[PDB]
Design a protein around this nucleic acid. Structure first.
Lengths: 151, 262, 141
RNA sequence: AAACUGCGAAUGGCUCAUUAAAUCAGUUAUGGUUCCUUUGGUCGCUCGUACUUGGAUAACUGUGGUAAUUCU
RNA sequence: ACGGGGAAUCAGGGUUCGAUUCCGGAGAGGGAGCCUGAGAAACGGCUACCACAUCCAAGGAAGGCAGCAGGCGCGCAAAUU
RNA sequence: UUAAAGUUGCUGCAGUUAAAAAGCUCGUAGUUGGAUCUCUCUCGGCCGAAGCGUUUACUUUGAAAAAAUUAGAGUGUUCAAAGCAGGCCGCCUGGAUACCGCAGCUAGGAAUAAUGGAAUAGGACCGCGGUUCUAUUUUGUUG
RNA sequence: GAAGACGGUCGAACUUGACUAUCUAGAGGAAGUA
């Protein structure tokens, strides 16, 4: 329950969890030691990462990805898939003949780790480039900042 | 393509070889080797286009096949063998020794050195790894690997090789106040003192270098070669001292060389 | 008046490229119907077989009979009336002849007096009409 | 000479039919891969007939088939 | 419509071209499948089908110029076996 | 096919009568929007490493941007289009430089133009308090 | 260790339909064209 919802046993692959022990620790405090790492670009790992119990192999903090490439940022529009959200990135494109600009946008399906709970729509995520996680997913949510009005 | 390419068109050759347009369709196309083909001199270009010892590629074949050319102490019969930055080309029959060092305009100069100097060279360490029962390793900028270096040698330092043994004699560390040559980009061939290094994580670092006359320029970190310690270079420097003149003062020097000579 | 703001580049260029189709020169050379109606198919010259000599009558404020030639083109089988320029140059033209036909000058419109004729003859039997007219060559036998 | 072995024949040359975020250009990444060759490293690190091992097959000799092949 | 570097024109802004010797892609009549090899879905390699087409003693055998020349065709339009 | 064409108009056209303004009001996107606010903390040698300062646009800089082509320096191909050579009596000297939009990097500037922050105070700065877990220094050694 | 065969896969092509497009043989006619 609460993790094992799939047909296969979910576990962090780096942590061995069947270390035998004597009854003074076998009965006293039962804690699976969590694997987490520190991604390197000044981003600090959230609290829910290092103490949570979720298992996500695509999480940037407790899974097997590395963050290298482009740091970008968008705004959450759709939260309707399993562990992956859709952001929108707005920019101005310079047309040279008219010396002017036009509002364009591009969508990005991006992977959202379960360590970012309380993510609304309309708020600004920071995304980092990883290896291709899916057919259309190449980025990963690294930092969430709320919208302007949510006190 | 269905595989690796073997030709080089003459227009797409590197600019600093100073080939011209009309003598052929092809360029010499360097062999694979210790230096990159955008960063090397093939031995055929050094021996007939620079030294004028030959007039054809056939004569370069005849000169090299008599085993007369040693590059870094070893005989090379390959006429497209890529010589590169700070290689010692030593012709024993004429008693000449050369080192490939960039000019202030970013081309390899015909720099003659004494046979005292022709027994060493400087290399830039690009990679350190520990491998297979804890033996530390180097990888220099010309594909040498060295087992058991000094443990103070770190990446981006500059070591000194003895060309017969292949072993390190001493080294310079990467620090502000040491002397550089730029080996890449716009600032190629310039020489000065490190004053600064700003570290951008996940990307390229930028090193600020100060010229001997107070000019200042930046490069990337990979385009930096530490020549000497403090101000003293550990090698002999070419005609210009790594001080790039502007076009106005180069014109003034070229005109002052005509009103005095003649 | 027209929009002028700093972010109006999409409104400005999508309006210009839609008002560009109201120009006669753009609509002619960017639609493709006028190129499929051109019997030359965009070529400068063409070649055809002379079907019959034809006298076309001049338009009203002057009076003569212009000496044209009805010619069926080789490359697509379209039929064409084409004007034979100088005098006694219809005498040089037999029937079922190879002929070389150019445009007449106004790029598909009928040059002044001759009604509905867009073309003129340049060569006949691979000899130019100017060489026959000035007596430099003769028609082969 | 021939033939076996090895390497090359994936480069070059030609053309512009397809192809409209595709190709391509600038920029980045492989910490997500493979790499003949060149260059350097490594190659008594292993505790268990050798002063040299075995069977063939071309070229060659000889007998041929098919109207016909760089066939056999 | 192969894409770029680029080209013509030009007060300034622009408009049109880029098949074409440099770089990148693609394809070897049309599709498909492979062997060998570090590297090919290779075509001056192989195996089929489709369309063409060659030699034949009628049993069978062989093919691929969008390489250099050259020929036919096509055309307004382009060179030496 | 380009200029002529200010006859496609961004610079830069026109809409009473020459071609032309919607029957009227509402109204989403888009476009455009009134004044207003004058840098520091631990170490390493008084300065740097550690933070940036709300976030961008803008601007200036830097480096990175194939050659050829274009602009352009030198040089009497006999001149020139070209070429990259050449010049003294073995020497001497070249084979420069600029431009390369947009997108992406770097560093200064802070006017203009967006955006943020304390109004159920869940506000800042302070000392004081309580709850939970923990760095490993601490007991010649070891437990 | 060859021929061969069961199966699987990739898959050109073949047949019959349906829709759609083109090239060609095709009576009749109409209007305008002059």
């Amino acid at each position: 329950a609460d993790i094992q919802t799939e047909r296969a046993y979910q576990k962090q692959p780096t942590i061995f969890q069947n270390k035998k022990r004597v009854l003074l620790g076998e009965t006293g405090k039962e804690k699976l030691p969590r694997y987490y790492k520190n991604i390197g670009l000044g981003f600090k790992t959230p609290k829910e990462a290092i103490e949570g119990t979720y298992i996500d192999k695509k999480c940037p903090f407790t899974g097997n990805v590395s963050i290298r490439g482009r740091i970008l940022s968008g705004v959450v529009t759709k939260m309707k898939m399993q562990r992956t959200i859709v952001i929108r990135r707005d920019y101005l494109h310079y047309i040279r003949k008219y010396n002017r600009f036009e509002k364009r946008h591009k969508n990005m399906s991006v992977h959202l780790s379960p360590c970012f709970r309380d993510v609304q729509i309309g708020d600004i995520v920071t995304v980092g480039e990883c290896r291709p996680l899916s057919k259309t997913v190449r980025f990963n949510v690294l930092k969430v900042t709320k919208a302007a009005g949510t006190k | 393509a269905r595989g690796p390419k073997k030709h080089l068109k003459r227009v797409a050759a590197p600019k600093h070889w100073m080939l011209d347009k009309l003598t052929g369709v092809f360029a010499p196309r360097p062999s694979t080797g210790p230096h990159k083909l955008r960063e090397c001199l093939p031995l055929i270009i050094f021996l007939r286009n620079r030294l004028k010892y030959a007039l054809t590629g056939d004569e370069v074949k005849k000169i090299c096949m008599q085993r007369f050319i040693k590059i870094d102490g070893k005989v090379r019969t390959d006429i497209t063998y890529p010589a590169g930055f700070m290689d010692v080309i030593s012709i024993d029959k004429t008693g000449e020794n050369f080192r490939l060092i960039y000019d202030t305009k970013g081309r390899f100069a015909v720099h003659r050195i004494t046979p005292e100097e022709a027994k060493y060279k400087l290399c830039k360490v690009r990679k350190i790894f520990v491998g297979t029962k804890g033996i530390p390793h180097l990888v220099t900028h010309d594909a040498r690997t060295i087992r058991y270096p000094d443990p103070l040698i770190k990446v981006n330092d500059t070591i000194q090789i003895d060309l017969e043994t292949g072993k390190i004699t001493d080294f310079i560390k990467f620090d502000t106040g040491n002397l550089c040559m730029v080996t890449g980009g716009a600032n190629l061939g310039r020489i000065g003192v490190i004053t600064n290094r700003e570290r951008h994580p996940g990307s390229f670092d930028v090193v600020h270098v100060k010229d001997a006359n107070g000019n200042s320029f930046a490069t990337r970190l990979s385009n930096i070669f530490v020549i000497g310690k403090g101000n003293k270079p550990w090698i002999s420097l070419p005609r210009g001292k790594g001080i790039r003149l502007t076009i106005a003062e180069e014109r003034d020097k070229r005109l002052a060389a005509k009103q005095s000579s003649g | 008046g027209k929009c002028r703001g700093l972010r109006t580049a999409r409104k400005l260029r999508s309006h210009r490229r839609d008002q560009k189709w109201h120009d006669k020169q753009y609509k002619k050379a960017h639609l493709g119907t006028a190129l499929k109606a051109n019997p030359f198919g965009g070529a400068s010259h063409a070649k055809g077989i002379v079907l019959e000599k034809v006298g076309v009558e001049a338009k009203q404020p002057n009076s003569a009979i212009r000496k044209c030639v009805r010619v069926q083109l080789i490359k697509n089988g379209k039929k064409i009336t084409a004007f034979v320029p100088n005098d006694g140059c219809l005498n040089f033209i037999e029937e079922n002849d190879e002929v070389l036909v150019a445009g007449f000058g106004r790029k598909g419109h009928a040059v002044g007096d001759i009604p509905g004729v867009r073309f003129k003859v340049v060569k006949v039997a691979n000899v130019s009409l100017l060489a026959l007219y000035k007596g430099k060559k003769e028609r082969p036998r």
